[PDB]
Amino acid sequence: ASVHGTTYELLRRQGIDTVFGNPGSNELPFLKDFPEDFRYILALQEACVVGIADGYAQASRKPAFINLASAAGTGNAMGALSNAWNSHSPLIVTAGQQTRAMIGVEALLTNVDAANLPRPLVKWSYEPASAAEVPHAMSRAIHMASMAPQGPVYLSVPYDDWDKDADPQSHHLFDRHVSSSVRLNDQDLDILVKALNSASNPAIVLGPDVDAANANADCVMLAERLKAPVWVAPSAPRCPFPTRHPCFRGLMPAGIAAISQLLEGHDVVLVIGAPVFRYHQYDPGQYLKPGTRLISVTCDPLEAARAPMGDAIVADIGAMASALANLVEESSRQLPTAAPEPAKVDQDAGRLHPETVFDTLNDMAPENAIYLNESTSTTAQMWQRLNMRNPGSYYFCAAGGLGFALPAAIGVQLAEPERQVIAVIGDGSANYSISALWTAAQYNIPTIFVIMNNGTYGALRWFAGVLEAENVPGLDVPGIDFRALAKGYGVQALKADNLEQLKGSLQEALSAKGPVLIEVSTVS
Amino acid sequence: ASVHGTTYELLRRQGIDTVFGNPGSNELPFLKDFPEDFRYILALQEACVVGIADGYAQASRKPAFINLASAAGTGNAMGALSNAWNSHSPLIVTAGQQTRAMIGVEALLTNVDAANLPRPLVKWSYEPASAAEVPHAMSRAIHMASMAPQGPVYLSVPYDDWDKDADPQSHHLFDRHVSSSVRLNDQDLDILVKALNSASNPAIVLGPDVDAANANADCVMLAERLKAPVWVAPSAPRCPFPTRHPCFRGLMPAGIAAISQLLEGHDVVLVIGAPVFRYHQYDPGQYLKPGTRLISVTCDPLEAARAPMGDAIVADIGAMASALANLVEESSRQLPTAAPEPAKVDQDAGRLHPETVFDTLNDMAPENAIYLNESTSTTAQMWQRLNMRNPGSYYFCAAGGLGFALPAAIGVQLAEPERQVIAVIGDGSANYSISALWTAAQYNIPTIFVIMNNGTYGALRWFAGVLEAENVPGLDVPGIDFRALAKGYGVQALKADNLEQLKGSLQEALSAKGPVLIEVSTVS
Amino acid sequence: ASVHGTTYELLRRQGIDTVFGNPGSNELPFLKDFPEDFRYILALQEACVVGIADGYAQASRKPAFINLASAAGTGNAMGALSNAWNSHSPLIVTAGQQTRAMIGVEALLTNVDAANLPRPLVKWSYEPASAAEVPHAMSRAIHMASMAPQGPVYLSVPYDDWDKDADPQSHHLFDRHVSSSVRLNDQDLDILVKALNSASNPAIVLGPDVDAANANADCVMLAERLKAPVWVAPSAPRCPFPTRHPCFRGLMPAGIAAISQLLEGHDVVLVIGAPVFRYHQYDPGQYLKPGTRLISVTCDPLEAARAPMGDAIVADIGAMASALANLVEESSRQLPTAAPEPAKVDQDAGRLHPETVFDTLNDMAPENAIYLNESTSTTAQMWQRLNMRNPGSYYFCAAGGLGFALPAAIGVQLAEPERQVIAVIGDGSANYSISALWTAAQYNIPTIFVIMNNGTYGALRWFAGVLEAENVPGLDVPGIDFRALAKGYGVQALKADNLEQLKGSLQEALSAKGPVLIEVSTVS
Ligand SMILES: Cc1ncc(Cn2c(C)c(CCOP(=O)(O)OP(=O)(O)O)sc2=O)c(N)n1
Ligand SMILES: Cc1ncc(Cn2c(C)c(CCOP(=O)(O)OP(=O)(O)O)sc2=O)c(N)n1
Ligand SMILES: Cc1ncc(Cn2c(C)c(CCOP(=O)(O)OP(=O)(O)O)sc2=O)c(N)n1
Ligand SMILES: [Ca+2]
Ligand SMILES: [Ca+2]
């Protein structure tokens, strides 16, 4: 067998059947003879390729396979890899290299010092030293991406390797099963459970790895048993809990002082599947107030090591959440009271308040909708106004890198064809990965894109305000016609300049057969 | 509090009380006001510093703390770090940096791009961006070294940081407990146990992480219950099993074909705490023969990913070995028969056969002796001839890097003052870290060093022979007087030119109050 | 032809005929069939291998070729590479890698991510992607080491590559000539010359790249023409000027304020072949005083970029010094007056003052002696007391990394068999690379080693004093018998406990046929 044939067999045997890519010449020997049982999803720029794959992996809860065009293609994707690193997304990023005989002279398309290129944003990065090693290296890549803590990996392959003979002993790779589905030993788990049972006023904080593990329901049971309020850890990349459950308390503000104040009076705070914590703004003060003990369960040693406070346990989130939910006592304390209904912001017949948009989406979208957020000045309101009952219902750029949501929404929609995906994206953010729209059109992936157009980088204007920073350039983005961009890439386009038009456009979009972009005129 | 005071409090609270070091000017502000409850162990060269610390950490089963002199000191230690990486040794390697105001100009002793220096041989490498971050960075270093898979880490600290004010909120670091003591979830563990119970002819292979976890006794119970022969994985850095237990089958040869042949007919092979596998020689063939399934339990994702065959489970070795030992059924198969007595090699009244040396050591050493091996051509015979009943009884350079055993034997002896350490080191190997002898003399650490002097790099002569490689230079090391070297560093020195002298010298050494070096004239 | 044959032909054609090494198994296929016209110089530890090669390269003014044992051997050499980077030493560091078929599984002796290991201390680091690339990669290594700014490079070669067929087109590599012997364009050079001619009180500062270029005599002419005092740049790795020439002003103290004060009143300061500047101690103040302009000529862009003041020209030091010396006008100013005779320190019949040692060496050593310094507390006095008339007469660890001088003195002596090498090394420093002594004995390289034994790390005690740092551990190194160490490695050993014995021992050493070590009892 060839390296090509063996590698595709390995991929298939390991459950991979889709290649997200933008091709180049070093990849043609890999992509030729493309298997009939595989899917290739083309995108027009590599940030888009990787964003789509990332959404697909996050929603599918399985690795996604990517093929990029040597160094330039890899490089174009590195912002997308920054997000994937923070979301623990299991991405197998492959790129073609020059033929081995031309690497030394640094022929055009040689990826120099290739393994160092995507560092430090990958868990493992490698170029094999021979053709026959390629299937083994691919096996390593699959497993490295997939073991907890999951994350992106990089493999560079000289294009002449594919046609070479494989090692027959590579057949041992095909059916390897590698598990990291582990939990704390019984003795220490019993100690933890006793501490939770004995807490007088516990609180729970959940991060994205809960949703990635589909541990959401177990966390609901845990919160009900402990009668504990539940927050989502700051800068949330995913939604780990039903947002109208009575225990839910919403998104934590991303500040040191704000979080210790929120946790004041809680004697034990159990954090599951989050860094401790993904703060953002400068908000100095106490990490925790006196009387609060924090215990973190994380899938990532790097998270456990860097937490500035608390105990930590490094284990699989699904295994731990299930064990804890089934072991803790039912507290006789009263169940927390549900958060009040959000206020309705006054809305005239002109430009839309973002709150109006979210309320309308919540009114009109199906109960199993999936939202993506890259409307950076409106996140807090979005989190308050969308009832997200189910797992896998929310994604936000995990490293804060714009250009995620537009392509990721396409990948999520590909992963979840029965769940309507609605990406709410600011006018500024929409441009970073605008060409991803084409993939939705070409493959008829029926994502809805809601562009919040206020003509400015609003979140930056806000942050400049708190700085009292004057004379900052580059904050306004006037003069972008998103309906024309959608037309450019073959996506049906609608406008919403007021509330009646927003409702009309959403109705039309929700009943459409393909992707739809709605340009919403929002308040500045 | 100062950064200095806070950092030493963190170290003490995290169980660190000893600094292994060779000082330099960038470290003086760290080392000044050295706490009265800490120990400083000086060694004269940094390979020695790190080797001593490594032995101490491996034997103590806890992190060891190191302080080195900027880039040159770090650099001198990098061979030692190669071994530490392969042994999963929890080493906290710190080095001083120039004062922040002088880093830009690259003053003498500036460690340029410091974090990259020890890569790729460390789990984490870092220089803090401010003085107040230093205690937090130290906390990260401690935990990164200590979480499974354990390994060396590197922290570079500008020397002016120590006297600066610490963040009062660093007190939250002091008592953090971070656990990776995890095992496979119950459902999947039950599947594994059923596969082990149903095996008709199981075999077990154990690696160094068993001994590091002190899982040895649990592995004995597991082997007895399964009635399974037990091998030590190739290139063994430690001894994970009693070498005269009836199930023991010795050290696996480090070859692909040799290992699959040894495993032929075993339907399930359970590997615990080893890479799969640390082959060495070129020995092409089948990874496994038809009819053998391999299942690996490893603490290291990188091991699990790169195994060319088998299933894998990534978990703590102690937690897994204990669980498996207590869950498997007692097989009614007959217990394996003990290996036969090794042959006595004919020995005249002249130079010693290595087999004679090992037999004599086994006859005369206490039953709780600890051996170290850096006598590279004699390893197979050593493994056959020493009865090592207890855990922590054997160490060998885990990356094959010479210069480990001489200093490591000092660290092991410091860790285990009641267990006589005997380092068996070739004449070639002895030179790499010869100055470590001084530390044994200075601190009166009573290691015994047995130098196997055959005047040559024997293992290289052997490997050249199998290559039929002629005209290789540099293989002979005549003209080294090890008794004079020992005198040079203040260590009592004896000779053994024949068997009667070997016995006499060993008797004298075993009753000595300090370290002793015996130069043994061995056959060429 | 094989890769082996082609590579050795390339080396020979490029002027390389000596391999400095410590062998390992991955190197045996390279070292076999070793050419009869090549020399192999064995050393017993890799810091020693590289130090010897470094001295040889620095003194010979040509590249030196090194072969080390995979990752551990490379790692053991990294402190030595730190010095080589700072001295711009042209070192071609090669290491063997595992056979390509065993790299993926990370067999013992696999150098993982090999090219990253010696970073950031090398100019170029590489592992070829195929056997036929190896000669080309070797060519790259040779030229990268040799082009200005010269420095160490690293090449890792899988051991199976050597026996493979070479590309016949590799013959084009053999006779490539690559020049960086460049100087500033005429127009801009004329501007510089006019600025020098018009200076009213010029000063010159010279660094190690002057001596490396053998630009010393040109710099003498330049200083005579400009009637300018000449200093050696701080932390000097080499001696770039005759130390009893009337213009000579000695070693600059390595402090910001001290240097600007020394330069006060000099309107133009021309620095040649030095960083600006290799400061060490914290000595804050002005980089230059008002009225001083600095112009630097450096071979290294990294030096030019980081200078905090002055103009810079990046060019070959030999070409620039020759051009400037021949273009500047003869000033009618008076030639600077020679520095006064150093004082004779009172010396009783007991332990030696270091000043006495240097005065005696200066009295008894030949006029073409070569000195090495690793007696860290005595450098200033050494520089005042040795008349070094010729180029290539002084070496000191360029990165401050101890363990350089003992092996480097052997390499220098090998390079300059007609010039007596005398290494003056502290008792502390002597231990780092002590085993290098064996190479001097084995190859009968007649270096003289003068060990300054004061029982302590004196320079650290001094630096602690200025810090008022109390309770620093690890500063004393009692109990080392250097005569026994010399005996250990087969080197003739003498003692000097007083002045009469020092004279007697030096007389005996200077007339000896082999290497000699003299242990001198110096004041504490
Ligand atoms: C790749 C990239 N570039 C720039 C930014 C900086 N950035 C920018 C440019 C923001 C403004 C986004 O504007 P928007 O129109 O999408 O939404 P708002 O008007 O609601 O802020 S928010 C923010 O962090 C970024 N995070 N990521
Ligand atoms: C740091 C380093 N350098 C070189 C080697 C190469 N090496 C060398 C030099 C060996 C010979 C050791 O000789 P010895 O006298 O200690 O023992 P034997 O004579 O029993 O082989 S075995 C081997 O792998 C190495 N492994 N590590
Ligand atoms: C490899 C390494 N380790 C440690 C040091 C720190 N160091 C040490 C240990 C010095 C003392 C050397 O003592 P010596 O006996 O050789 O000479 P003096 O007594 O004259 O200082 S000077 C100094 O910078 C270093 N520069 N390089
Ligand atoms: Ca509503
Ligand atoms: Ca799906």
Ligand SMILES: [Ca+2]
């Ligand atoms: Ca906007």
Ligand SMILES: [Ca+2]
């Ligand atoms: Ca016996």
Ligand SMILES: [Ca+2]
């Ligand atoms: Ca102990």
Ligand SMILES: [Ca+2]
């Ligand atoms: Ca030997």
Ligand SMILES: [Ca+2]
């Ligand atoms: Ca004199």
Ligand SMILES: [Ca+2]
């Ligand atoms: Ca010469």
Ligand SMILES: [Ca+2]
């Ligand atoms: Ca000294």
Ligand SMILES: [Mg+2]
């Ligand atoms: Mg490095």
